[PDB]
Swiss-Prot record, chains D, E:
Protein name: Large tegument protein deneddylase
Assembly and binders: Interacts with host CUL1 and CUL4A; these interactions inhibit the E3 ligase activity of cullins. Interacts with inner tegument protein. Interacts with capsid vertex specific component CVC2. Interacts with the major capsid protein/MCP.
Annotated localization: Virion tegument; Host cytoplasm; Host nucleus
Functional summary from the UniProt entry: Large tegument protein that plays multiple roles in the viral cycle. During viral entry, remains associated with the capsid while most of the tegument is detached and participates in the capsid transport toward the host nucleus. Plays a role in the routing of the capsid at the nuclear pore complex and subsequent uncoating. Within the host nucleus, acts as a deneddylase and promotes the degradation of nuclear CRLs (cullin-RING ubiquitin ligases) and thereby stabilizes nuclear CRL substrates, while cytoplasmic CRLs remain unaffected.
Length: 145, 179, 54, 40, 40
């Protein structure tokens, strides 16, 4: 979130408040404690773009995918989840984009929905079962992916 | 009666106005429409005194089991430059996906336009509902002569009637411009 | 020809009642404007003795 | 007399205009429907 | 103010009613003549 507001305030400064930004993006309330973080970025210069190039393809996507899925044998849960989408997204007229342009806006669209979802379900992780605080000793076991 | 309210959220915004139409069996026997749930409907309109084509749209239709009774649809109406034309055919094309069946059902706007005349943040939840009441208004098809019903659902609206732009002279006779 | 004599005969009957039903709905949608404008006078009359007080 | 005479003038004259605008809409509702059965 | 406010009220409201009664007579003069050439 902080790397996005570092790019908003570089072009238009009035939309980002330093009293609002460096107050809830520098404290991490976890395990009854807080932790300070040393941040002035360059590592997250692609997730700020992959999540934003995905950010506009979802509202066009979840109406093009729902106009095709309507029939006598719709799965009954999407009768409920049809209403959660806002009213302005329900008025996207897809006449302004052609059909061989819409395919280019799906194979791009789905490929970010996977490759952003996969890099947090990547599991070089290890389950600690014993620990002591004043010795910094710990034992665990490893389970990949 | 669910297919009216489904089409207002998926065919509804892609049009200008919808023509909610329920077809009785007397219309179905004349055009020979075998009511199976496999049927895919497709709609497009044929303009007049202009380059005539509109895009094709898929409209959902369901049988209404019983106060009329029959097939329920919704026809698209297109307003180029802010008004309707009176002599402007809306074509309904009926086809099955697998078998050999193609039927063309044709409607005229003056039989439809006249028939319409009388802290965490909140996310909204707007499902499809048949809660809106219907007002059943009669009509006749010009081409076949079989009656069909038109719904009028409740919602610069009551002040104005529905805009029409009648053709101008010189004009061929409307028995020859309809066909 | 005898089918064109029946197309021109019937569609001058189906379209004729459509134009007459349009003509009623032009008139009744403007009579609504008159009764919205007559009653707009009478509503201003109900405080015209109040507009003479300012 | 500004309250009394304007009450009897600017209501009774207004109601006689309003009840005759409804005579035009009630005339076409009778006569155009008479064209439909008698002549069509 | 009885002369001033009744002048602007009971003339400007009256003229907007009168100019729309002429809209009904100008509508049938156009549309009934349209029935004559297009459909007869």
């Amino acid at each position: 979130v902080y790397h996005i507001y570092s790019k908003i305030s570089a072009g238009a400064p009035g939309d980002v408040n330093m009293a609002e930004l460096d107050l809830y993006t520098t404290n991490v309330s976890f395990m009854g404690r807080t932790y300070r973080l040393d941040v002035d970025l360059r590592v997250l210069d692609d997730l700020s773009m992959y999540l934003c190039i995905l950010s506009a393809l979802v509202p066009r996507g979840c109406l093009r995918l729902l106009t095709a899925l309507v029939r006598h044998d719709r799965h009954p849960l999407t009768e409920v989840f049809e209403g959660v989408v806002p009213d302005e997204v329900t008025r996207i007229d897809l006449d302004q984009l052609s059909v061989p342009d819409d395919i280019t806006r799906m194979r791009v669209m789905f490929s970010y929905l996977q490759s952003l979802s996969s890099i947090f379900n990547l599991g070089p992780r290890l389950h600690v079962y014993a620990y002591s605080a004043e010795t910094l000793a710990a034992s665990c076991w490893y389970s990949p992916r | 009666m669910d297919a009216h309210a489904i089409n207002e959220r998926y065919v509804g915004p892609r049009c200008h106005r919808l023509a909610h139409v329920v077809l009785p069996r007397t219309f179905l026997l004349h055009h020979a429409i075998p009511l199976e749930p496999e049927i895919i409907f497709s709609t497009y309109t044929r303009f007049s005194r202009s380059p005539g084509s509109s895009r094709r749209l898929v409209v959902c239709g369901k049988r209404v089991l019983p106060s009329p009774s029959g097939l329920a649809l919704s026809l698209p109406l297109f307003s180029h430059d802010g008004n309707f034309h009176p002599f402007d055919i809306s074509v309904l094309r009926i086809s099955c996906p697998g078998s050999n069946l193609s039927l063309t059902v044709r409607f005229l706007y003056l039989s439809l336009v006249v028939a319409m005349g009388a802290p965490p943040v909140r996310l909204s939840f707007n499902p499809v509902n048949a809660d809106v009441p219907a007002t059943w208004r009669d009509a006749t098809n010009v081409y076949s002569g079989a009656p069909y019903y038109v719904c009028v659902y409740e919602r610069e609206d009551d002040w104005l009637p529905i805009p029409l732009s009648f053709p101008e002279e010189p004009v061929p006779p409307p028995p020859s411009l309809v066909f | 020809s005898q089918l064109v004599r029946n197309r021109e005969r019937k569609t001058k009957a189906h379209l004729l009642s459509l134009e007459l039903d349009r003509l009623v709905q032009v008139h009744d949608s403007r009579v609504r404007v008159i009764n919205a404008d007559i009653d707009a006078v009478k509503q201003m009359i109900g405080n015209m003795t109040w507009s003479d007080n300012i | 007399t500004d309250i009394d005479t304007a009450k009897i003038t600017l209501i009774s004259f207004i109601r006689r205009i309003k009840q005759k605008v409804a005579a035009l809409s009630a005339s076409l509702a009778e006569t155009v429907d008479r064209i439909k059965k008698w002549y069509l």
